[PDB]
Amino acid sequence: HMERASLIQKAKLAEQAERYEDMAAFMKGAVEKGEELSCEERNLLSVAYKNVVGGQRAAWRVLSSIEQKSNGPEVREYREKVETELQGVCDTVLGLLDSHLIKEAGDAESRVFYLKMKGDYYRYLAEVATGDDKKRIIDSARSAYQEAMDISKKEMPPTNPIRLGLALNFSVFHYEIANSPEEAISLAKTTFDEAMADLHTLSEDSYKDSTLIMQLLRDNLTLWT
Amino acid sequence: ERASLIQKAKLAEQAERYEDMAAFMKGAVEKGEELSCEERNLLSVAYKNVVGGQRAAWRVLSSIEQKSGPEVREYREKVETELQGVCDTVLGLLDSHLIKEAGDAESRVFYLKMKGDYYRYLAEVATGDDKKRIIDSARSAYQEAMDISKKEMPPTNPIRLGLALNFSVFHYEIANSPEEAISLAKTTFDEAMADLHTLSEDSYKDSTLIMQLLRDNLTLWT
Amino acid sequence: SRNSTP
Amino acid sequence: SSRNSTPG
Ligand SMILES: [Br-]
Ligand SMILES: [Br-]
Ligand SMILES: [Br-]
Ligand SMILES: [Br-]
């Protein structure tokens, strides 16, 4: 049973069983059916790949930290193996975004969501890349986040959680990847202040969603300043 | 290479990459040199984590399938097939490299206990014509290990205690023999209790942890 | 919640 | 104590 609805049901079962590689492979199959994803389906795709790449990123940081603290060939070789696997997962997500998810039609929410995801997966590639390849990947991540920022400022209110989450991640990109802390701090401050001005005009459910991301923006500002 | 494979297994353990850790330990076993006590523990921890994740996923799926839909059944079968492949890999290593006539009683009981454990994991998901064969293979391995441990190890040895703990779980959940499960846990606890005051500092934590697990199972079952 | 060796 | 990116 591998019709589109069966693949989504299997992704939900894999999520309950904490089998994120299975969940990501089921969501990849569902995306390749060619139909748009609902908000619930987008979240399933995002959670699945975030867990997969999150485990590889965590392993890479443990290895990189051992490799640096020691300053044998084993740590380097094993770190390269984890890197190659992480790169394969990012290339798969970037491939899905290019061939199926990123399009001209659809609401601003879906367009910003996928463009933000494109910036995020290029940012994960940038974390492990070196030399000229790293420079090109950094410029590719910036272009995707910038295109998403332009849409969100024109078509979404400043309290929209997708708009807030994009600014949070683009601010992290500026700070850690692009080495532009001034741009990182000013983007997080501006995003926080513009949302703060409109928070009183939201319902309890929306207020809860916006303030949760606003706390993360504040937490990063407290850490960096 | 062997020293590199063991070092990579230790790096994989720190990074919580248990499938990589198991594959590195499998490569080290295939070099032919006996495993030290530290190396045996690395092999055991690696496969226990891998199969532990599959067993947990299988229980979630089985529970949904019974609470309730061809999708749950198909996905449960996929997880089962993967779990079976991991058990077959461990049973293959035990048969071709680790289980031997030579070596101290400690190493022989350790591997025979591991053989009983991986057949017990196969028995947890078996429902057809092979079920009886799989259960008798788990039983035979634990029984052979029990015979060696009673003749050659002191009753407070943590490997002997851990084997009795697992064989007692086998009797209770797999063989449906709760009386045999309770009497084995009670006998193991009592025989260790009599020698507890002479136990050496090196086995304090391990022996007392398993004695607590034997006590916990008795409190749960009686 | 039965226990087997860790 | 560690920077935040979106939980999704
Ligand atoms: Br490697
Ligand atoms: Br399946
Ligand atoms: Br069977
Ligand atoms: Br016995």
XYZ file of C-alpha atoms and ligand atoms in Angstrom:
465
model
C 0.000 0.000 0.000
C 1.867 3.046 -1.325
C -0.844 5.390 -2.629
C -0.379 9.022 -1.380
C -2.800 8.665 1.605
C -1.061 5.387 2.727
C 2.379 7.067 2.663
C 1.071 9.906 4.885
C -0.499 7.407 7.304
C 2.793 5.478 7.447
C 4.662 8.752 8.128
C 2.324 9.345 11.112
C 2.938 5.776 12.403
C 6.722 6.221 11.961
C 6.534 9.493 13.946
C 4.773 7.717 16.861
C 7.441 4.953 16.755
C 10.273 7.604 16.635
C 11.522 6.119 13.339
C 12.476 9.449 11.674
C 14.429 7.984 8.709
C 11.344 5.858 7.820
C 9.095 8.943 8.379
C 11.266 11.058 5.999
C 11.282 8.346 3.289
C 7.441 8.065 3.514
C 7.052 11.897 3.261
C 9.483 11.977 0.326
C 7.301 9.407 -1.465
C 4.151 11.452 -0.715
C 5.745 14.693 -2.074
C 6.759 12.847 -5.276
C 3.061 12.100 -6.014
C 2.996 15.748 -7.313
C 0.263 17.181 -5.103
C 0.522 20.186 -2.777
C 1.012 19.497 0.918
C -1.498 20.684 3.467
C -0.186 22.603 6.561
C -0.262 19.325 8.572
C 1.615 17.429 5.783
C 4.300 20.214 5.486
C 4.907 19.925 9.237
C 5.263 16.117 8.941
C 7.876 16.558 6.146
C 9.730 19.227 8.173
C 9.734 17.261 11.497
C 10.955 14.102 9.745
C 14.000 15.658 8.007
C 14.802 17.983 10.979
C 15.132 14.900 13.233
C 17.264 13.003 10.686
C 19.665 15.908 9.999
C 19.577 16.873 13.732
C 21.093 13.532 14.721
C 23.844 13.867 12.092
C 24.581 17.495 13.088
C 24.820 16.423 16.790
C 27.188 13.541 15.917
C 29.295 15.882 13.741
C 29.637 18.366 16.628
C 30.770 15.619 19.076
C 33.426 14.401 16.562
C 34.579 17.902 15.570
C 34.949 18.789 19.288
C 37.101 15.646 19.934
C 39.176 16.341 16.781
C 39.788 19.941 17.949
C 40.423 19.148 21.663
C 43.161 16.666 20.650
C 44.999 19.548 18.882
C 44.772 10.449 15.255
C 43.506 9.772 11.700
C 40.418 7.876 13.021
C 38.467 10.950 14.289
C 38.989 12.740 10.962
C 37.929 9.723 8.859
C 34.821 9.043 10.958
C 33.902 12.778 10.998
C 34.163 12.747 7.152
C 31.842 9.696 6.982
C 29.164 11.460 9.109
C 29.634 14.635 6.975
C 29.093 12.698 3.710
C 25.878 11.202 5.102
C 24.607 14.634 6.337
C 25.368 16.084 2.870
C 23.318 13.312 1.216
C 20.292 14.106 3.422
C 20.541 17.893 2.663
C 20.911 17.200 -1.095
C 17.738 15.033 -0.935
C 15.718 17.841 0.796
C 17.092 20.503 -1.588
C 16.184 18.220 -4.528
C 12.578 17.816 -3.272
C 12.249 21.603 -2.744
C 13.531 22.379 -6.264
C 11.601 19.744 -8.186
C 8.258 19.671 -6.335
C 7.606 22.087 -3.461
C 8.877 25.542 -4.454
C 6.431 27.090 -6.950
C 4.815 30.365 -8.045
C 1.289 29.534 -6.873
C -0.041 29.026 -3.311
C -0.439 31.322 -0.329
C 2.531 33.393 1.000
C 2.722 30.993 4.026
C 3.536 27.944 1.924
C 5.990 29.855 -0.323
C 7.893 31.339 2.658
C 7.863 27.951 4.458
C 9.657 26.145 1.574
C 12.071 29.004 0.817
C 12.989 29.125 4.556
C 13.538 25.322 4.435
C 15.837 25.858 1.387
C 17.880 28.429 3.367
C 18.011 26.050 6.390
C 19.278 22.979 4.441
C 21.949 25.104 2.640
C 22.904 26.440 6.142
C 23.390 22.821 7.403
C 25.642 22.152 4.345
C 27.545 25.414 5.147
C 28.193 24.231 8.774
C 30.397 21.361 7.490
C 31.697 22.662 4.130
C 35.254 24.086 3.586
C 37.012 26.400 1.037
C 35.311 27.757 -2.124
C 32.414 25.256 -1.824
C 31.546 26.716 1.597
C 31.574 30.273 0.116
C 29.098 29.301 -2.663
C 26.822 27.439 -0.197
C 26.793 30.490 2.145
C 25.718 32.767 -0.816
C 22.984 30.163 -1.808
C 21.577 30.097 1.785
C 21.496 33.953 1.902
C 19.623 34.190 -1.462
C 16.904 31.724 -0.337
C 16.358 33.435 3.060
C 16.367 36.906 1.362
C 13.736 35.861 -1.201
C 11.612 34.449 1.702
C 12.072 37.702 3.723
C 10.877 39.818 0.764
C 7.656 37.759 0.423
C 6.962 37.720 4.200
C 7.359 41.507 4.649
C 4.971 42.187 1.724
C 2.327 39.525 2.348
C 2.316 38.491 6.041
C 1.606 40.343 9.309
C 4.673 40.839 11.613
C 3.226 38.420 14.206
C 2.897 35.464 11.746
C 4.903 32.561 13.239
C 6.331 31.475 9.852
C 7.599 35.057 9.280
C 9.011 35.123 12.877
C 10.680 31.682 12.482
C 12.260 32.694 9.172
C 13.733 35.865 10.803
C 14.963 33.752 13.746
C 16.821 31.336 11.393
C 18.157 34.042 9.027
C 19.437 35.870 12.139
C 21.238 32.599 13.208
C 22.668 32.367 9.632
C 24.050 35.961 9.888
C 25.602 35.279 13.316
C 27.187 31.779 12.883
C 27.666 31.290 9.143
C 28.067 34.712 7.538
C 30.045 36.164 10.488
C 27.789 39.290 10.477
C 26.733 39.652 14.161
C 25.556 43.249 13.713
C 23.133 42.180 10.974
C 22.050 39.173 13.119
C 21.283 41.346 16.212
C 19.556 44.132 14.277
C 17.323 41.613 12.388
C 16.302 39.846 15.622
C 15.651 43.219 17.398
C 13.602 44.615 14.475
C 11.555 41.389 14.128
C 10.880 41.290 17.898
C 9.880 44.995 18.085
C 7.563 44.874 15.039
C 5.773 41.790 16.425
C 5.617 43.349 19.953
C 3.618 46.313 18.591
C 0.821 43.990 17.312
C 0.732 41.202 19.976
C -2.356 42.711 21.758
C -4.477 42.189 18.584
C -4.221 38.375 18.655
C -6.409 35.513 19.941
C -5.079 33.253 22.755
C -4.090 30.468 20.250
C -2.295 32.872 17.875
C -0.766 34.877 20.765
C 0.709 31.611 22.121
C 2.266 30.737 18.731
C 3.831 34.143 18.118
C 5.148 34.631 21.680
C 6.878 31.215 21.635
C 9.103 32.305 18.708
C 9.476 35.825 20.152
C 10.986 34.157 23.260
C 13.575 32.384 21.042
C 14.452 35.724 19.366
C 14.877 37.229 22.867
C 16.953 34.226 24.075
C 19.362 34.698 21.113
C 19.632 38.462 21.828
C 20.428 37.711 25.533
C 23.100 35.208 24.421
C 24.715 37.555 21.852
C 24.504 40.962 23.603
C 43.008 -1.771 11.435
C 41.646 -3.617 14.550
C 42.837 -0.854 16.885
C 41.231 1.700 14.471
C 37.883 -0.175 14.384
C 37.755 -0.260 18.205
C 38.649 3.437 18.407
C 35.919 4.239 15.843
C 33.433 2.181 17.916
C 34.324 4.335 20.954
C 33.859 7.558 18.884
C 30.505 6.255 17.541
C 29.396 5.520 21.131
C 30.188 9.134 22.185
C 28.269 10.443 19.125
C 25.289 8.086 19.921
C 25.644 6.474 16.480
C 24.868 2.871 17.600
C 24.432 1.350 14.091
C 27.921 2.679 13.171
C 29.267 1.439 16.569
C 27.834 -2.083 15.910
C 29.291 -2.217 12.367
C 32.761 -1.161 13.702
C 32.590 -3.846 16.478
C 31.468 -6.439 13.906
C 34.581 -5.581 11.826
C 36.815 -5.881 14.913
C 35.305 -9.339 15.811
C 35.952 -10.537 12.240
C 39.741 -9.934 12.782
C 39.856 -13.204 14.812
C 41.443 -11.996 18.072
C 39.456 -12.702 21.282
C 37.676 -9.691 22.772
C 38.796 -8.239 26.074
C 36.099 -7.588 28.767
C 35.976 -3.888 27.641
C 35.632 -4.915 23.937
C 32.838 -7.479 24.721
C 30.926 -4.721 26.525
C 31.359 -2.378 23.509
C 29.943 -5.094 21.183
C 27.046 -5.783 23.591
C 26.134 -2.063 24.148
C 26.191 -1.370 20.400
C 23.775 -4.176 19.354
C 21.573 -3.764 22.498
C 20.944 -0.117 21.510
C 20.220 -0.968 17.865
C 17.766 -3.829 18.667
C 16.346 -1.848 21.626
C 15.151 0.876 19.264
C 13.551 -1.672 16.924
C 11.883 -3.546 19.823
C 10.448 -0.217 21.122
C 9.139 0.711 17.633
C 7.639 -2.792 17.211
C 5.788 -2.460 20.541
C 4.316 0.949 19.570
C 3.081 -0.440 16.197
C 1.777 -3.717 17.670
C -0.132 -1.718 20.326
C -1.761 0.521 17.636
C -2.591 -2.554 15.506
C -4.311 -4.240 18.495
C -6.084 -1.131 19.848
C -7.727 -0.637 16.400
C -6.213 -0.631 8.128
C -3.572 -2.589 6.154
C -0.953 0.198 6.731
C -0.194 -0.590 10.424
C 0.290 -4.293 9.627
C 2.578 -3.605 6.647
C 4.715 -1.088 8.555
C 4.890 -3.413 11.616
C 6.117 -6.222 9.292
C 8.803 -3.897 7.865
C 10.126 -3.067 11.382
C 9.958 -6.816 12.289
C 11.999 -7.783 9.196
C 14.656 -5.201 10.122
C 14.778 -6.398 13.784
C 15.128 -10.004 12.511
C 18.057 -8.973 10.291
C 19.896 -7.420 13.268
C 19.318 -10.556 15.454
C 20.497 -12.820 12.572
C 23.690 -10.711 12.261
C 24.462 -11.063 16.035
C 23.631 -14.819 16.014
C 25.897 -15.202 12.961
C 28.836 -13.437 14.729
C 28.312 -15.600 17.859
C 28.345 -18.836 15.827
C 31.244 -18.034 13.496
C 33.631 -16.170 15.826
C 32.734 -15.697 19.487
C 31.358 -18.973 20.892
C 34.207 -21.474 21.410
C 35.120 -24.512 23.618
C 38.244 -22.659 24.948
C 38.445 -19.501 27.098
C 37.449 -18.797 30.701
C 33.895 -19.619 31.980
C 33.178 -15.889 32.097
C 33.587 -15.333 28.320
C 31.725 -18.562 27.441
C 28.712 -17.689 29.643
C 28.701 -14.089 28.314
C 28.350 -15.193 24.651
C 25.918 -18.041 25.379
C 23.726 -15.544 27.359
C 23.903 -13.161 24.352
C 22.782 -16.073 22.094
C 19.779 -16.721 24.402
C 18.944 -12.977 24.432
C 18.970 -12.516 20.605
C 16.823 -15.690 20.107
C 14.469 -14.290 22.814
C 14.134 -11.018 20.760
C 13.306 -13.174 17.671
C 10.749 -15.102 19.821
C 9.009 -11.814 20.870
C 7.934 -11.175 17.222
C 7.520 -14.868 16.058
C 3.940 -16.007 15.368
C 4.204 -18.842 12.822
C 5.710 -22.325 12.355
C 9.227 -21.248 13.478
C 8.064 -19.921 16.918
C 8.650 -23.238 18.787
C 12.070 -23.716 17.140
C 13.140 -20.122 18.064
C 11.983 -20.503 21.697
C 13.805 -23.854 22.130
C 17.018 -22.270 20.668
C 16.765 -19.405 23.320
C 16.099 -22.025 26.071
C 18.965 -24.338 25.023
C 21.466 -21.432 24.937
C 20.434 -20.090 28.388
C 20.435 -23.654 29.866
C 23.943 -24.413 28.566
C 25.108 -21.035 30.020
C 23.403 -21.812 33.402
C 25.188 -25.205 33.613
C 28.621 -23.603 33.074
C 27.962 -20.695 35.487
C 26.786 -22.936 38.372
C 29.892 -25.152 38.043
C 32.556 -22.517 37.384
C 31.461 -19.100 38.745
C 30.640 -17.805 42.257
C 26.918 -17.019 42.885
C 27.654 -13.277 43.213
C 29.354 -12.992 39.755
C 27.456 -10.295 37.806
C 27.541 -12.285 34.522
C 26.005 -15.289 36.326
C 23.391 -12.961 37.984
C 22.543 -11.219 34.691
C 22.121 -14.552 32.901
C 19.689 -15.769 35.626
C 17.813 -12.464 35.447
C 17.331 -12.787 31.639
C 16.523 -16.553 31.709
C 13.930 -15.769 34.427
C 12.406 -13.094 32.067
C 12.426 -15.753 29.260
C 10.470 -18.209 31.510
C 7.927 -15.520 32.477
C 7.206 -13.780 29.100
C 8.221 -16.244 26.380
C 7.827 -19.747 27.790
C 4.692 -18.816 29.840
C 6.206 -20.586 32.919
C 5.816 -18.022 35.745
C 6.482 -20.579 38.496
C 9.847 -21.468 36.927
C 10.593 -17.724 36.449
C 9.854 -16.865 40.140
C 11.712 -19.878 41.549
C 14.823 -19.132 39.404
C 14.879 -15.446 40.453
C 14.325 -16.434 44.115
C 17.062 -19.112 44.075
C 19.542 -16.773 42.308
C 18.824 -13.940 44.774
C 19.119 -16.208 47.857
C 22.363 -17.903 46.732
C 23.973 -14.495 46.037
C 22.624 -13.079 49.338
C 24.492 -15.753 51.340
C 27.868 -14.599 49.873
C 27.109 -10.826 49.617
C 29.388 -9.962 52.594
C 32.492 -11.433 50.888
C 31.843 -9.716 47.448
C 34.773 -7.703 46.000
C 34.680 -3.908 45.474
C 35.056 -4.263 41.677
C 31.683 -6.075 41.345
C 29.781 -4.049 44.051
C 27.728 -1.859 41.683
C 27.069 -4.499 38.992
C 26.152 -7.363 41.366
C 23.950 -5.147 43.590
C 22.239 -3.576 40.520
C 21.249 -7.007 39.147
C 20.159 -8.213 42.642
C 17.852 -5.153 42.751
C 16.479 -6.045 39.280
C 15.831 -9.651 40.456
C 13.991 -8.172 43.520
C 12.021 -5.710 41.288
C 10.848 -8.576 39.023
C 9.781 -10.689 42.041
C 7.789 -7.702 43.452
C 6.125 -7.236 40.033
C 5.264 -10.937 39.567
C 4.279 -11.979 43.137
C 7.856 -2.934 33.450
C 10.012 -6.114 33.932
C 13.775 -5.785 33.878
C 16.349 -7.556 31.772
C 20.116 -6.733 32.097
C 20.966 -3.191 30.939
C 22.534 28.490 26.917
C 22.757 27.450 23.210
C 21.325 29.535 20.307
C 17.865 28.746 18.981
C 16.711 27.941 15.492
C 12.987 27.023 14.882
C 11.956 23.728 16.506
C 10.690 22.686 13.055
Br 35.056 5.642 9.051
Br 5.831 -0.288 4.795
Br 7.662 -17.711 13.021
Br 18.455 -23.715 35.684
